[PDB]
């Protein structure tokens, strides 16, 4: 077992209480999962709420509350500049001042699943061992109830789309990102290829975080003992052979046949897309997120979006000749 801090990003919402109450209720050990609450903004009521938890958490305060000079295209986005400054300061605190080896980053509007800690404890060794991974996330971007298999709460995947929303990173990655941290829109900046460098994140079939106060993502409620499972299938070499053979070995169905629930005997199928317009159209037809960041679809892996549709496993996939993302798919 390893020590992994939880870094909570807070500011001016008193409801950080709900976030902390759930983290503290499910935390298995204070020693294994120290909680550090970084509060920006100087909102007095929120500070009093965090302080009331005492030694159960460590309360740190972003020091520079000044307004930030924004570029000419960003007059409406001061808040995004402040968020980026806060993340830079808080992550620096976690990795430089506290000297932790990794951290799970969570925002104050997230509620955790019962197995949130078990999940990160089990996946941290994979992140440490596989250089092709750069994070573990608790979030399934297409995680609404009707799109996930409730009988497979233990199932995990690789994704090229950095989901944020409860994510684990190594101190080594902060060393790489810190020198070029952006002025604003930090998460979309991490999604650019110049930052991602082809690396993936682990993500679950059923989300381990949910937002409150995205609202339709289902929070897992069945505890899965991930530390007792064999997660070797997530190693790049095994995954890229087996999961891909599975996707391309599955029968192909036209999107309208999947939409209307035709050929129900086929419990796992592939819907093939061929260009940006067909991807957007097919994703919309099947109720899957259709937006792309730097050409990567939500929850996509080698261009493949996997989800459940009317109880059937569906892989919305490009032709197997796929060889990289095109950022122009906007
Ligand atoms: C997870 Hg707050």
* Helix share, percent: 25-40%
Number of discrete helical segments: 10
Under CATH, the homologous superfamily of the largest domain reads Spore Coat Polysaccharide Biosynthesis Protein SpsA, Chain A
- Percent range for β-strand residues: 15-25%
Bound molecules: methyl mercury ion
Major sheet: size, sense and barrel closure?
8 strands, mixed
CATH class assignment of the largest domain: Alpha Beta
PDB class: transferase
Keywords: alpha-1, 3-mannosyl-glycoprotein beta-1, 2-N-acetylglucosaminyltransferase
Assembly: monomeric
Entry title: crystal structure of N-acetylglucosaminyltransferase I
Q: What would your notes on this structure say?
A:
Residues 1-330 are lumenal. Mn(2+) binds at residue 109. Interacts with MGAT4D. Interacts with BRI3. Substrate binds at residues 13, 40, 86, 108. Its cofactor is Mn(2+). With 330 residues, this protein is an alpha/beta fold. It folds into two domains: 2-214, Spore Coat Polysaccharide Biosynthesis Protein SpsA, Chain A (Alpha-Beta Complex); 250-329, 2,3-Dihydroxybiphenyl 1,2-Dioxygenase, domain 1 (Roll), CATH 3.10.180. 30% of the residues lie in helices and 19% in strands. The chain contains ten helices and 15 strands. The protein has an eight-stranded mixed sheet, sandwiched between helices. A three-stranded mixed sheet has the order 11-15-14. α2 (44-51) links the parallel β2 and β3. The longest helix has 20 residues, at 78-97. The protein is globular and about 60 Å long. The N and C termini lie far apart (42 Å). 36% of the residues are buried. Bound molecules: methyl mercury ion.
């Amino acid at each position: 077992l390893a020590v992994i801090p939880i870094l909570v990003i807070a500011c001016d919402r008193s409801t950080v209480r709900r976030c902390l109450d759930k983290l503290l209720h499910y935390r298995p050990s204070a020693e294994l999962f120290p909680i550090i609450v970084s509060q920006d903004c100087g909102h007095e009521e929120t500070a009093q709420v965090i302080a009331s938890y005492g030694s159960a958490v460590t309360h740190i305060r972003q020091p520079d509350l000044s307004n930030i000079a924004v570029q000419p295209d960003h007059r409406k986005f001061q808040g995004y500049y402040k968020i980026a400054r806060h993340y830079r300061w808080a992550l620096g605190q976690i990795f430089h001042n506290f000297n932790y080896p990794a951290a799970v980053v969570v925002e104050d509007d997230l509620e955790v699943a019962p197995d949130f800690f078990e999940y990160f404890q089990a996946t941290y060794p994979l992140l440490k061992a596989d250089p092709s991974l750069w994070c573990v996330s608790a979030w399934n971007d297409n995680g609404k109830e009707q799109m996930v298999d409730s009988s497979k709460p233990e199932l995990l995947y690789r994704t090229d789309f950095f989901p944020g929303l409860g994510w684990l990173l190594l101190a080594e990655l902060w060393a790489e990102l810190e020198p070029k941290w952006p002025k604003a829109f930090w998460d979309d900046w991490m999604r650019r290829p110049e930052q991602r460098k082809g690396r993936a994140c682990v993500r679950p079939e059923i989300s381990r975080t949910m937002t409150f106060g995205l609202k339709f993502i289902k929070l897992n409620q069945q505890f899965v003992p991930f530390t007792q499972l064999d997660l070797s299938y997530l190693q790049q070499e095994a995954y890229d052979r087996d999961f891909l053979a599975r996707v391309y070995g599955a029968p192909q169905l036209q999107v309208e046949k999947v939409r209307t629930n035709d050929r129900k005997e086929l419990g796992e199928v592939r819907v093939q897309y061929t260009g940006r317009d067909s991807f957007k159209a097919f994703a919309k037809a099947l109720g899957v997120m259709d937006d792309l960041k730097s050409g990567v679809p939500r929850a996509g892996y080698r261009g493949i979006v996997t989800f459940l549709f009317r109880g059937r496993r569906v892989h919305l996939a490009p032709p197997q000749t796929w060889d990289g993302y095109d950022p122009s798919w906007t």
